[PDB]
Design a protein around this nucleic acid. Structure first.
Length: 341
RNA sequence: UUUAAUGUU
């Protein structure tokens, strides 16, 4: 259903075709695979007035391009290099479609690009349309990215409805593929008063989360970027289980971060547990040093352990070298242990 | 030797 001029363009019958020249066809070229690219590149080094000529032809049926496989690129360009006015107009064409577009394979982009470039006032307007639909968005393959961009670009006090939406859902969403990524954004960007009710629910389930394919990434984040009081809680839930969680494919990464981020005093108590403890008819460190996952925790322990504590652990391992040497899940520990012969 | 999203030209 193309046009002569467009078929024409595809036949390379215009090696030097200009923007000014496809006027009255901006809409048709925007929904074409080559036409759209063409416009996209001509816009990148076009004059303001020229871009305006194109902008005019895409404004009215702007929503149609926003959800089009090829036109989602053209609208985006205007959000990146367009004038303030052009952006407020596009944002105006978005008003009332925010939700549908945030869940659309192509629209979600546009929404994300717009959230990154429009002023706070227009961002706050756009974000409201999502209130009451936050979970549906988080669980959507396209929507989770939008919810996510809001948190990164929009003022925190405008995202209060996001926090409320998570009320009694933190556990359910931490063990969700997209939900965990959103929660980590919240922990990184939302305010102190807002993050508190989220952390409260995580602590309540902290044990089940270190063992989840996703949950263990949320707890690791608290340890790497959270408040000491928060870290303290986690390490306290890990204590008494250092040995077993260290060998778990998922929780072992958390105990790793615990040994690395906890407080002095706590760090010494984690080393003391595995040191003053025994596994089978064999040493606790013996099991960890040759284990696929636990071996990293011992490495972490050797580094952060303090003089007195550190030799102890070296006196615990020294009797098992011959064995350690033949374990590739053991060439870094060993390596430590040699640094002081 | 260590785990994460089947998010577009």
């Amino acid at each position: 259903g193309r046009s002569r001029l467009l078929e024409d363009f595809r036949n390379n019958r215009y090696p030097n075709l200009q923007l000014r020249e496809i006027a009255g066809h901006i809409m048709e070229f925007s929904q074409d695979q080559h036409g759209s690219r063409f416009i996209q590149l001509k816009l990148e080094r076009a004059t303001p007035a020229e871009r305006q000529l194109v902008f005019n032809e895409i404004l009215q049926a702007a929503y149609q391009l926003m959800v089009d496989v090829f036109g989602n690129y053209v609208i985006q360009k205007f959000f990146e290099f367009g004038s303030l006015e052009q952006k407020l107009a596009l944002a105006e064409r978005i008003r009332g479609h925010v939700l549908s577009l945030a869940l659309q394979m192509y629209g979600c982009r546009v929404i994300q690009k717009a959230l990154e470039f429009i002023p706070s006032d227009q961002q706050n307007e756009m974000v409201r349309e999502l209130d009451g639909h936050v979970l549906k968005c988080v669980k959507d393959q396209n929507g989770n990215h939008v919810v996510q961009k809001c948190i990164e670009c929009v003022q925190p006090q405008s995202l209060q409805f996001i926090i409320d939406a998570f009320k009694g859902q933190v556990f359910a969403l931490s063990t969700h593929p997209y939900g965990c990524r959103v929660i980590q954004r919240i922990l990184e960007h939302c305010l102190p008063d807002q993050t508190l009710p989220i952390l409260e629910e995580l602590h309540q389930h902290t044990e089940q989360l270190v063992q989840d394919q996703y949950g263990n990434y949320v707890i690791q984040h608290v340890l790497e970027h959270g408040r000491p009081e928060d870290k303290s809680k986690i390490v306290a839930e890990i204590r008494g289980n250092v040995l077993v969680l260290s060998q778990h494919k998922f929780a072992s990464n958390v105990v790793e971060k615990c040994v690395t981020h906890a407080s002095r005093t706590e760090r010494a108590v984690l080393i003391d547990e595995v040191c003053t403890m025994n596994d089978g008819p064999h040493s606790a460190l013996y099991t960890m040093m040759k284990d696929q996952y636990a071996n990293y925790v011992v490495q972490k322990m050797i580094d952060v352990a303090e003089p007195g504590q550190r030799k102890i652990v070296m006196h615990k391992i020294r009797p098992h070298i011959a064995t350690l040497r033949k374990y590739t899940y053991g060439k870094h520990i060993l390596a430590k242990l040699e640094k002081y012969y």
